[PDB]
Subunit: 317 residues, 3 copies
């Protein structure tokens, strides 16, 4: 009689379909998904330091809009900008807005140090009804609106040395009056000119008198500029009118900080990978949630599923 | 005696050489080419909507050069710009030319809507001998050259609200006169200044009086600018001279439109993939015709041939 | 009795560990390194034409700083800029510095041809104590500082046609005086304006009077500009003051030239691949020395070692 001895292998009743080099559909005993396609829907507050902008853009928090005073000197790994944010101060623009937003976002700090600028012979601390704090007229917290003192605006020629070990970031501006009479009334002379320089760089800005459409009832504008001053260099501001003056400087750091546009709620939880849709797990190598990411994240791909076989071909009975 | 039974495989007298991981030259029974290396030499008019610029650059068709009146309000999937195209109107430049060309190309339409700007107190519709239509003096069709009315040019302070559901694109300009006397003669005052604003943006441009080399016998220049106005925003033009005024706005759309530089003839035929050399078949995954493509195209690679084996090793008798 | 015949394979006592698709550590009999991780520490002078900037940036060699006269008309495949380089002429800036540096670097030549500009009615060849040659006052060799002649500066309206077969690169500038009295004293009128044009392009620059921090005891500045003039086009310079005039043009070539920041010594040796750390051998496909390369170089990767098996699995006795 003898015996029979058969060699074989397992199979399962519920196999899974994968792709190969020779066949788009072959059933294997088991597989694992390599594309992360879902989010929790919230941004976990840990382990990255999250700063929710709430009503404030980063730039409004920088300048010191009245809704943004709670942001002073705060730091972040990720600043989260909300689509509902809006300005509630004097109407302004920033030539190169994207670059200023980016460099501050990347620096990851709003640390500000006041300095004693000698604004000899002018009126300081100008305010406006378009920028209220607690119903009083106010202005951007970090800027100083200078105007005539007894119908004189003597030329400004003011120095601030950087004897620090770090770079200083200065934010300053130019006021564009609506009319010639408004120019004379604020600055006591027909036009201004502003030259802000260091040993390595110079910027000159000319105010442009005229009507723009009213925003918070104001037809004039402020245009915002910035200047970085290296250790051992010197800031020189030379102006005859229209200067929106700095009150001091911001620290610039380098590191891992960034900014993200999202309306996802912030939650008490821990997740390394952030997207605008919310935090996502980062076990998988790929993800199709969002091209926009921050942290230790899977790589964005177009596929919504990629199954890796983790078993042999399934050959059911 | 018994029998003999031999196992074997086919071969061919005309095998083809392919590359592998271990050998740069191995003969197989058959192969297929993966790189498309030839074109028909013409651009097929189907299935993409092709617009041949002929004598006109896209920007000349936009502004309304006298050779380009047939382009009014036309749409395209691909605008084809010819190397022979040249301007035949007033000499101009466009700071950022590449960006204006790109954004119009991508929008894919020259749809234009006239609007009723109230140009109170000036002469409209200025023309020039450098921009003839049918031997008369003429000008860019979409622009309005304003000059003094009885030696006055009163300040312009003109509004145009966008109460549409779409964005509006405005094209406008500044005239740079050749001399101080030409400035006075056209605008009745020593200089102009132009500020074009919305609630979100502002641009001011200063005319620059002086000689440039003569082009179509003109030593002055026009410089072209643009402004996009969102729904619920308002265009404000404020100027004292030198304004080359808009006559209305262009629609801006988003979609699949582009622009290509080519001198290939347009033909009656159907091909999904367009290159500057002509349309190419798109069965192959790769191509070495041109890095510049439009449509469903193979991917550009440096290799001129890549043969994929489609049979076994060829082992001839 | 019979015989025994065993099939087998070699092994070695000193195998090497490699990575595979199924195992991060498997021992093979032999392997070869695919990542170049060391440099000689010097830049080999062959076979690329190397130009050591020494004390000179490329831009200082272009303009003609007093420390850079030995660079006149020199050509390079690779211009090597040293971190110790510093300027020793009139303090200047270049809006777009990076682009001018890049285009000259890529052109690979400082070939300069003097031209006879007719500067009618002004004093030529102005000099300064901030730009000495051999203790005399001097200036940038390739620039011509024009000032009043007997308290007149009549308007300049000067032409230079390009009747060559190649493009011409013109470098020119604007002087920004420290004060109104300095402006009058040099140019005999209250301000200048400079318009430099061709048939295709125009640039106008306004001098900006004011104090900048002293550099080599000078509080004024020069700002540098450039203009390319195609064959059959014409350069037109129109100015009433403050012009830092060209003396002629640079040839612009196209080819394989570039620029590299490095403090590595130049040596007498032959190596195709240059990095800032020094030349590296280029037998390997990859390297982790520097992302910055010039010549026939391995590709930069993050790994510091990648071992390719060149033998079978090692199975010791
Ligand atoms: C189909 O094929 C897949 C892939 O092979 C199988 O999925 C694996 O299943 C095993 C067993 O369930 C999983 O193992 C468990 O996950 C963790 C593994 O530890 C590593 O990964 C985690 C991430 O979760 C890291 O944080 C960690 O540092 C390790 O690198 C453990 O958390 C689990 O722990 C449990 O067992 C241990 C044993 O000591 C205990 O300490 C704990 O109490 C706990 O109960 C466990 O080890 C593995 O994660 C799965 N991989 C994937 C990719 O999903 C399927 O099982 C298979 N299906 C079938 C039917 O065969
Ligand atoms: C060497 O190796 C190559 C690659 O395997 C072989 O080339 C193939 O040859 C076959 C047979 O000639 C070709 O088949 C023909 O092409 C079309 C295939 O249909 C698909 O592809 C077309 C693109 O052309 C798509 O539009 C379509 O939707 C399909 O996805 C058909 O158009 C042809 O149709 C003919 O036969 C059918 C049969 O029903 C009829 O309906 C028609 O009347 C018509 O006569 C046909 O099927 C195939 O395209 C070739 N592939 C490639 C990549 O070239 C060589 O044959 C082989 N050489 C040797 C000597 O063995
Ligand atoms: C472990 O595995 C590695 C990889 O297989 C082996 O390394 C190879 O070893 C051989 C033998 O020593 C090396 O061969 C020598 O290198 C040159 C080969 O010529 C080509 O490559 C050079 C670059 O060096 C090119 O310039 C040239 O154009 C060729 O493309 C030759 O320079 C050497 O020449 C010597 O022998 C010839 C024989 O005719 C003579 O003319 C000369 O006099 C001279 O003495 C020689 O051919 C090969 O380069 C190595 N490759 C690598 C990648 O390192 C190890 O040998 C192996 N180890 C063990 C223990 O098995
Ligand atoms: C130049 O043109 C602009 C734009 O048309 C003019 O601005 C407009 O000025 C009027 C008159 O002051 C503004 O009216 C105000 O509206 C508010 C809002 O309801 C109201 O509270 C005030 O009582 C007043 O009615 C109008 O808002 C403003 N329009 C825009 C778009 O800004 C400007 O007056 C013109 N200048 C001259 C000198 O003509
Ligand atoms: C400032 O410099 C420019 C450039 O040299 C001068 O422009 C030149 O002006 C002359 C005189 O009008 C032009 O001559 C004309 O040439 C045409 C072409 O054949 C001809 O049809 C006319 O009858 C006349 O001869 C010349 O073309 C022009 N050159 C360029 C390059 O534009 C300008 O005159 C100077 N201005 C002053 C005030 O000196
Ligand atoms: C406008 O503000 C600037 C900056 O404070 C003033 O520039 C400064 O001018 C003084 C007076 O000439 C310079 O002093 C000089 O220092 C050198 C260096 O040791 C020395 O050799 C001279 O004898 C003299 O003491 C000073 O260097 C300079 N500072 C900077 C940062 O450039 C300028 O004077 C002010 N202008 C007016 C009209 O007030
Ligand atoms: C640069 O700063 C200087 C120093 O105050 C200014 O020059 C003075 O300007 C006033 C008013 O215009 C004149 O009365 C003085 O005679 C000037 N002094 C000197 C030494 O020239 C100058 O106006 C400043 N520039 C700008 C753009 O504000
Ligand atoms: C995560 O959010 C992104 C961003 O909105 C979503 O991507 C958009 O998906 C819609 C379809 O609902 C498309 O119309 C848009 O093209 C996508 N937006 C952009 C800006 O490209 C995505 O659906 C979300 N993913 C998950 C898993 O929630
Ligand atoms: C901005 O528009 C206003 C409104 O017309 C202009 O201001 C007037 O300018 C004229 C002529 O220069 C003066 O006579 C009026 O007194 C001004 N009116 C007011 C209310 O100030 C102004 O010129 C325009 N700006 C530009 C750059 O064109
Ligand atoms: C398609 O057109 C391109 C564009 O001109 C051709 O590529 C050029 O080829 C010439 C050789 O005749 C080279 O000198 C140039 O470097 C290429 N041009 C550019 C701009 O890089 C190409 O030969 C054409 N291909 C086919 C298949 O017709
Ligand atoms: C452009 O060049 C012309 C030609 O010299 C200059 O125009 C002359 O300017 C002088 C002095 O300002 C006047 O006296 C003449 O009447 C002008 N001539 C003409 C024909 O207008 C003009 O100043 C130059 N522009 C610049 C910016 O320098
Ligand atoms: C070649 O030079 C580069 C450039 O400095 C070196 O890379 C730097 O390595 C240091 C560590 O000593 C890091 O802190 C820096 O991040 C690197 N620099 C930059 C600018 O990224 C590199 O070490 C050198 N490699 C060799 C083989 O000598
Ligand atoms: C510093 C100063 O003088 N501020 C005044 C401003 C400016 O004159 C204009 O805003 C300039 O355009 O105007 C107000 O109507 C305002 O904005 O509230 C009153 C305010 O006191
Ligand atoms: C609107 C207007 O006044 N147009 C006139 C222009 C301008 O004066 C200059 O072109 C400005 O530079 O000059 C002409 O010689 C021309 O170009 O044909 C006559 C023409 O009637
Ligand atoms: C051409 C000319 O007039 N050069 C003079 C300059 C300029 O007046 C200023 O540098 C302009 O800012 O000033 C000097 O002190 C200098 O720099 O050496 C004296 C020099 O002879
Ligand atoms: C098959 O069934 C087992 C037991 O219910 C389960 O654990 C396994 O994961 C199932 N299917 C797939 C596709 O993973
Ligand atoms: C933000 O603004 C809205 C009004 O637009 C208000 O309801 C909300 O309380 C504000 N929150 C903060 C923190 O300023
Ligand atoms: C070999 O010959 C056959 C018949 O002539 C042909 O169809 C085949 O495609 C030939 N060669 C190659 C390289 O394809
Ligand atoms: C285009 O311009 C050339 C002259 O340069 C002319 O021959 C041709 O007829 C013109 N065609 C059109 C459509 O304007
Ligand atoms: C092993 O030893 C031989 C002879 O000493 C040597 O040539 C070989 O390269 C050695 N090891 C490795 C890791 O290459
Ligand atoms: C470069 O400058 C330094 C002084 O900073 C000097 O020692 C050296 O000799 C100079 N060399 C040349 C070639 O100018
Ligand atoms: C200017 O200097 C050059 C030498 O650099 C000389 O040829 C020329 O004659 C000088 N011109 C004047 C007007 O001084």
């Amino acid at each position: 009689p003898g015996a029979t001895l058969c060699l074989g292998h397992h199979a399962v009743p519920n196999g899974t379909i994968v792709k190969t080099i020779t066949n788009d559909q072959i059933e294997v005993t088991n597989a694992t998904e390599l594309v992360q396609s879902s989010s929790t829907g919230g941004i976990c507050d840990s382990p990255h330091q999250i700063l929710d902008g709430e009503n404030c853009t980063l730039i409004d928090a920088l300048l010191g809009d009245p809704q943004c005073d709670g942001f002073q000197n705060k730091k972040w790994d990720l600043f989260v900008e909300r689509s509902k944010a809006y300005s509630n101060c004097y109407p302004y623009d920033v030539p190169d807005y994207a670059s200023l937003r980016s460099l501050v976002a990347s620096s990851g700090t709003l640390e500000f140090n006041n300095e004693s600028f000698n604004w000899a012979g002018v009126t300081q601390n100008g305010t406006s009804s378009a920028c209220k704090r607690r119903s009083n007229k106010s202005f951007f917290s970090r800027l100083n609106w200078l105007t005539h003192l007894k119908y004189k605006y003597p030329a400004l020629n003011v120095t601030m040395p950087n004897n620090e070990k770090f770079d200083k970031l200065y934010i300053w501006g130019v006021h564009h009056p609506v009319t010639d009479s408004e120019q004379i009334s604020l600055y006591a002379q027909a036009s201004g000119r502003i030259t802000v320089s260091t040993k390595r760089s110079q910027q000159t800005v000319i105010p442009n008198i005229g009507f723009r459409p009213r925003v918070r009832d104001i037809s004039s504008r402020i245009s915002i500029y910035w200047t970085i001053v290296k250790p051992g260099d010197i800031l020189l501001i030379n102006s005859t009118g229209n200067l929106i003056a700095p009150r001091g400087y911001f620290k610039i750091r380098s590191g891992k900080s960034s900014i993200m546009r999202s309306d996802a709620p912030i939650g008490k939880c821990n997740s390394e990978c952030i997207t605008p849709n919310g935090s996502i797990p980062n076990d998988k190598p790929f993800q199709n949630v969002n091209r926009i990411t921050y942290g230790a994240c899977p790589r964005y791909v177009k596929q919504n599923t990629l199954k890796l076989a983790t078993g042999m071909r399934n050959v059911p009975e």
